[PDB]
Amino acid sequence: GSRKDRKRVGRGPGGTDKTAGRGHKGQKSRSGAGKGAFFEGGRSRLIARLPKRGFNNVGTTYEVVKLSQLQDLEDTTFDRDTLEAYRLVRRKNRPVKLLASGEISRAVTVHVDAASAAAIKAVEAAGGRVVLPE
Amino acid sequence: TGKKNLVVNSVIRRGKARADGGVGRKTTGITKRVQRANLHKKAIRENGQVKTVWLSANALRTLSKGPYKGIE
Amino acid sequence: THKMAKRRIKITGTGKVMAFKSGKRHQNTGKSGDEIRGKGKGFVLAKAEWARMKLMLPR
Amino acid sequence: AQINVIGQNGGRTIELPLPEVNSGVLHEVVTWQLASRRRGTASTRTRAQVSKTGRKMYGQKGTGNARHGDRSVPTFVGGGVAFGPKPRSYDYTLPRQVRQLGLAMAIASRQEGGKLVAVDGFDIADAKTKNFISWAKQNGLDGTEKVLLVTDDENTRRAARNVSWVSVLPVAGVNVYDILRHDRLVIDAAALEI
RNA sequence: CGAGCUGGAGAUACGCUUUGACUCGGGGAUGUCCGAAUGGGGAAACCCACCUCGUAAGAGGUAUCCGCAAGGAUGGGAACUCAGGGAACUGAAACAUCUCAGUACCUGAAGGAGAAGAAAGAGAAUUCGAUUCCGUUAGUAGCGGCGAGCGAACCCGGAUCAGCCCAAUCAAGCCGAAGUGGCUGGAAAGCUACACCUCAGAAGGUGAGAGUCCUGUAGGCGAACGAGAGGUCGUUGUUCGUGAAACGAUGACUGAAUCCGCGCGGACCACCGCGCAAGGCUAAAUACUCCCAGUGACCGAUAGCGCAUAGUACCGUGAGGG
RNA sequence: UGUUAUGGCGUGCCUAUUGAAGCAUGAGCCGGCGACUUAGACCUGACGUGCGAGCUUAAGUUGAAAAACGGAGGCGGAGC
RNA sequence: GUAGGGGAGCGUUCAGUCCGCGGAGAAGCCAUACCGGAAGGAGUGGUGGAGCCGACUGAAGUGCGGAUGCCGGCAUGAGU
RNA sequence: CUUGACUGCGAGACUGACACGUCGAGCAGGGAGGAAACUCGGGCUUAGUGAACCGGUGGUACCGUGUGGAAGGGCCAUCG
Ligand SMILES: [Mg+2]
Ligand SMILES: [Mg+2]
Ligand SMILES: [Mg+2]
Ligand SMILES: [Mg+2]
Ligand SMILES: [Mg+2]
Ligand SMILES: [Mg+2]
Ligand SMILES: [Mg+2]
Ligand SMILES: [Mg+2]
Ligand SMILES: [Mg+2]
């Protein structure tokens, strides 16, 4: 019954009414009331005067696949690029890359776009292979 | 107004201080930045019957070296 | 705002802010040697809190 | 574990939500619902701009005792309103899991008391509205309660027409408000049931 | 439709109507003078003519602009659309580039929509395949006194999807189920005691608070007639401020090929890859609300449009205000 | 409770201010009108709910006394 | 205890739900010596002539003494 | 006698709201003076200064828009 239906106990607070308060005349006293110009950035305060250029590129970015995920749990399901969709590695937009994180022995075979040196080493050391396209 | 196509209808005109340079000056910088218009030449010839009108220089060079829908 | 991107306001893993050292960039040098490699790494966060507000989305 | 009107048993299916009957979630849900149905239409000429007045007035100095720019300002009578209602929306997306959890928890909130499932809505014999009163009476419904009937079978629901006894929500159009608001839920068709 | 009617009108008189009035739909018939106004003039609603038709009374024609002719246009429209033209305050805490913004304003053209459209494209897959629209990419890639600030597109998800010609049901309306007695009361639709309909409990009216008292509602029917190229120079567009500035676009001067040909892919060259310009048409998805309908955690007389009707009274030479 | 006589005490309110009974501001009186909002898939925090190594949808489509569908995309998930 | 931060709450309108009240009289209006820690809320009386409390939740055009603030009405100066 | 008026770095502190500023052991590549312990990364110290932006010059080869280049950019010095 909706009559008896209660609140969340602390979801909603009331808002802020500045009418009344009796000794509320809000904001400052003078000086920087009434304006819509506040704006916490701006020109010469330690933003300019700061000496950077660098060079912007931001090119190819690979999807990180931890070894620690692949080994330990699941089945060694023979990943390829197929299973990654359901394996909770599904993101896309970018190629896939494998690197070493957790260190454990298992038999595993993974098809990704690229991988690191020590990752290769750890996939082979416990036996397995990692495929790459030409 | 012309013979073939378009006439008048023009756009703005600029000027630059620190003009030219060593191609690799400091920069170009600007002053002028105001709107402006364009006109063309008058001439008189007939088509379909005796007439006068006005003739675009392009249209004049066109009509002179051949009759494109018109004669002199 | 689009200035602070290629210039360093840069944010780290701890959500701290990288500016480094300005000591002399290009004009006005010809004094000592460790001021020159004195081009640094370092920052305070007192003005970081409002810094990255400019870099907020593409950190 | 609930009993049907005509024929077999069931409802041993559908574990009912945990913890059992949380009223907070219920609240969130219905509030979300009435906010969904809420239709923003707002007559305010809020802006000094929206009401009509020619804008230059008398004079800034030397008239004595006023200082006004226009006849259309909020501090005047007849002008615009400062911060009046405009046609907003307030329709949002409630997280789905809380919708599901909601109406589930509703049905469950009927487990502490009367609820009903049914098969064989053929006992109406066309509609006649009277045979619905019969069906109700012999099913224990004297319409001293409020009843939400949920069923397919157009003929079967078309039988029930009144704001007194009942209300009709067809083809599993179930609405957490619509159930929690009525006194008894009669779930009838076992389709979205089980 | 079937007893009333004779406008708001309160009002007397005269009457009209079952040989169907009134009212409601549906076509025609008359339509003074002005106004695009158009015989000619003109301080709009006025002043003056001419040529036919002829019995006067009275009808008809007499503007310019396209055309053999038929025929078409000149005007008007709240907002919406395209186009010719094009502000400043303001922001940069001053100010010139920038911002305001192609915003406001003026103007031209047109429809119920417009615009746009059938790759000399997007683009980096030897992918895509007209346009517009929405979501999204994405405050990204970029532009910038690299200041303030500005800000895409491809992919992808949807709305809707057509490419064709050519130059050597809804409107009048009608039909509609089911209650009486007693009681308080001025008056009941309320209370009460019993009863009934319900593919009809939506609603308003009736002396007060209404299913069953009236109009209605669910449901049912329903008409004669009526609808449905390239370059150089000055420049500019898109994220494009002259930047390494490509490409589209033109004002001036120049003005090549055409099938082992021709433009593009962001100076430029080769390779490689997409593509055929200098001709037109082309529903739908889209925008708007003068008007009509339905609704509302919209107003209810200092609110709500300015107006519970008024652009009236009233102010101004006037635009204008009110 | 109403009124009153006498005693004691007793420098309007507001703003603006180092400082106001102020010979500083405002205001004849009563009524009514009258000022810290709203918008965005913006940002960042507090609390609350739901799922939780995962969490959500946007346009739209279909129903529409009702809500479901919609994974394009977004956020975690690796830093330099 | 001033700007300022924090906490509990009072009242008004609309809204959903619940309980209801009203011609043997609703809201509003008028008087009042009662209640409550305050915003406030009851009781009885007097007007009034249709509507309206209370509880729970939700949403605000939500609380006036001032702004030479707005509209309206009515005072002063003065029988000058 | 000579080029420590070096390159690569900085334990830990002085000082400033910030940005600047100051001092410095010691590790390396390589040096200079001394026989040697050792000392030196300018001058007995405290003044002898200019953030950002836009460009000029040498070096390195990171970006470089279908690809292989080049234009232009970037980084380490430096110049106004
Ligand atoms: Mg003040
Ligand atoms: Mg001050
Ligand atoms: Mg100016
Ligand atoms: Mg300015
Ligand atoms: Mg005050
Ligand atoms: Mg006197
Ligand atoms: Mg006298
Ligand atoms: Mg040393
Ligand atoms: Mg600058």
Q: Is C45 exposed, middle or buried (0-12, 13-18, 19+ CB in 10 A)?
A: exposed
| Length C29 CA → F67 C1' (Å) | 72
Single out the residue of A47, A51, A31, A53 nearest to residue C50, CA to CA. A47
Q: Which domain holds residue D187?
A: 1-194
The residue that minimises its CA distance to C1' of E92 is: A43
Does residue A126 contact residue A72 with C-beta atoms inside 8 Å?
Answer: no
Q: To the nearest whole angstrom, how far is the Cα of A52 from the nearest Cα of chain C?
A: 4
The encoded tokens of residue D125 equal: 């014999």
Side chain identity, residue D33: Q
Does residue C20 contact residue C39 with C-beta atoms inside 8 Å?
Answer: yes
| Nearest nucleotide relative to A2: CA against C1' | G17
Question: Residue for token digits 């009843």?
Answer: D147
| Length C32 CA → G29 C1' (Å) | 93
Q: Name every residue whose Cβ is closer than 8 Å to that of residue D24 and which is 6 or more positions away in sequence.
A: A6, A7, A8, A9
Single out the residue of B71, B70, B43 nearest to residue B57, CA to CA. B43
Parse chain C into domains and list their residue ranges. 1-59
D180 and A11 within 8 Å at the Cβ level: the answer is: no
Q: Which residue of A has its CA nearest to D176?
A: A2
A47 and C53 within 8 Å at the Cβ level: the answer is: no
Q: Is A32 exposed, middle or buried (0-12, 13-18, 19+ CB in 10 A)?
A: exposed
How many folded domains does chain D comprise? 1
Could you tell me the CA-to-CA distances from D27 to A5, A51, D89, D104 in Å, in that order?
6, 55, 20, 14
Q: Dump the DSSP string for chain A.
A: -TTT----SSSPPP----S--SS---S-SSSS-S-S---S--STTTBTBS-----------PEEEEHHHHSSSS-----TTTGGGTTT----SS-EEEE--S-----EEEE-SEE-HHHHHHHHHTSEEEE---
Residue of A47, A50, A55 with shortest CB distance to C22: A50
| Length A80 CA → E288 C1' (Å) | 55
| Nearest nucleotide relative to A84: CA against C1' | F77
Q: Name every residue whose Cβ is closer than 8 Å to that of residue A81 and which is 6 or more positions away in sequence.
A: A96, A111, A112
Does residue D72 contact residue D81 with C-beta atoms inside 8 Å?
Answer: no
| Residue D149 parent element (H or E) | strand D147-149
Residues in chain C: 59
Does residue A77 contact residue A83 with C-beta atoms inside 8 Å?
Answer: yes
Q: Which residue of D has its CA nearest to A2?
A: D181
Q: Which residue of A has its CA nearest to C25?
A: A51
Alpha carbons A125 and A104: distance in angstroms, whole number: 10
The resolution, in angstroms to one decimal, equals 3.7
- D11, D13, D19, D25: CA torsion to nearest 10: -70
Alpha carbons A65 and A95: distance in angstroms, whole number: 11
> Phi/psi zone of residue D126: left (φ > 0), alpha (ψ -120 to 50 degrees), beta?
left
Q: Are β-strands B16-17 and B29-30 bridged in parallel, bridged antiparallel, or unpaired? A: antiparallel
Question: Residue for token digits 């990654």?
Answer: A84
Alpha carbons D151 and D169: distance in angstroms, whole number: 7
The answer to whether D66 CB is within 7 Å of strand F is no
Interface check for A58 against chain C (CB to CB < 8 A): the answer is no
Does residue B46 contact residue B52 with C-beta atoms inside 8 Å?
Answer: yes
A50 and C7 within 8 Å at the Cβ level: the answer is: yes
Alpha carbons A100 and A64: distance in angstroms, whole number: 10
Backbone angles phi, psi at D28, to 5 degrees: -50, -50
| Length A101 CA → E315 C1' (Å) | 87
Q: Dump the DSSP string for C22-38.
A: -S--SSS--S-STTTTT
Q: Is D157 helix (H, G, I), strand (E, B) or coil?
A: helix
Alpha carbons D61 and A36: distance in angstroms, whole number: 28
A-D contacts (CB, under 8 Å): 21
Neighbouring C-alpha atoms within 13 Å toward the C-beta of D5: 20
Q: Name every residue whose Cβ is closer than 8 Å to that of residue A113 and which is 6 or more positions away in sequence.
A: A62, A95, A96, A97, A132, A133
| CA of residue D65 to ligand 6 center, whole Å | 26
Backbone angles phi, psi at D159, to 5 degrees: -65, -30
| CA of residue C33 to ligand 8 center, whole Å | 14
Beta bridge partner(s), residue A130? A110
The CATH number of C1-59 is 4.10.410.60
Side chain identity, residue D53: T
- A24, A27, A29, A30: CA torsion to nearest 10: -150
C6 and A55 within 8 Å at the Cβ level: the answer is: yes
Parse chain B into domains and list their residue ranges. 1-72
What is the DSSP secondary structure assignment for residue D16, as one 8-state letter? P
Does residue D49 contact residue D82 with C-beta atoms inside 8 Å?
Answer: no
| Residue D175 parent element (H or E) | none
Alpha carbons D136 and D5: distance in angstroms, whole number: 11
Interface check for A2 against chain D (CB to CB < 8 A): the answer is yes
| Residue C43 parent element (H or E) | none
The answer to whether D56 CB is within 7 Å of strand F is no
D26 and A11 within 8 Å at the Cβ level: the answer is: no
